[PDB]
Amino acid sequence: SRAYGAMVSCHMLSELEEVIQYKLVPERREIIRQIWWERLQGCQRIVEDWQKILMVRSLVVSPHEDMRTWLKYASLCGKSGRLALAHKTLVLLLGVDPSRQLDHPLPTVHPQVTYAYMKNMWKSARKIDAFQHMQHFVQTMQQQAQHAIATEDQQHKQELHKLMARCFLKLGEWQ
């Protein structure tokens, strides 16, 4: 346990070497990203270590290019009593600020990021407006899925169905 800090330092150095590999090799990008995700999953859930590792990885990976890792990090921050940083990460991922545009509905792009932001807002005691946004988002998702049902998109349709089931469960719990 006393050596864990040095272990994190070694992890960061290895990530740096893998970053130079990511820069050099254009066909290794997906493999490198999967390795980073799995190795980060292996590590402890301390916010500071995750922040250091993500800063290291940011040299070649913008947050938009990998929304899953930053969503996990934001969830960890939210569960660690740092809702300010979690909201900052969510608004960075979305690209627009729902806080300033209260009247404007939440964006539909990146539905996973939207759902994460909505649950963070629910944790932010803004329950009624969060529920209103959730109703609007469910209506948008169902109508968009109905319009965009096609044989080409099935895995996307399955993920959309999973997210919609989660949204329905959250709607029931919050009601």
Ligand X SMILES: O=P(O)(O)O[C@H]1[C@H](OP(=O)(O)O)[C@@H](OP(=O)(O)O)[C@H](OP(=O)(O)O)[C@@H](OP(=O)(O)O)[C@H]1OP(=O)(O)O
Residues near ligand X (CB under 6 A):
72, 75, 116, 119, 166, 169
Smallest separation, CB 102 to ligand X (Å): 23
Smallest separation, CB 72 to ligand X (Å): 6
If the CB atoms of residues 10 and 169 are measured against ligand X, the closer one turns out to be 169
28 is an annotated ligand-binding site residue: no
If the CB atoms of residues 22 and 137 are measured against ligand X, the closer one turns out to be 137
If the CB atoms of residues 21 and 51 are measured against ligand X, the closer one turns out to be 51
Cβ atoms < 10 Å from Cβ of 61: 19
Smallest separation, CB 97 to ligand X (Å): 21
166 is an annotated ligand-binding site residue: yes
Shortest Cβ contact with ligand X: which residue?
75
Can you say how many angstroms the Cα of residue 160 is from the centroid of all Cα atoms in its chain?
15
Smallest separation, CB 54 to ligand X (Å): 15
CA atoms within 13 A on the CB side of 16: 7
If the CB atoms of residues 136 and 166 are measured against ligand X, the closer one turns out to be 166
Q: Which residues are annotated as a binding site for 1D-myo-inositol hexakisphosphate?
A: 79, 119, 166
The annotated binding site is made up of 79, 119, 166
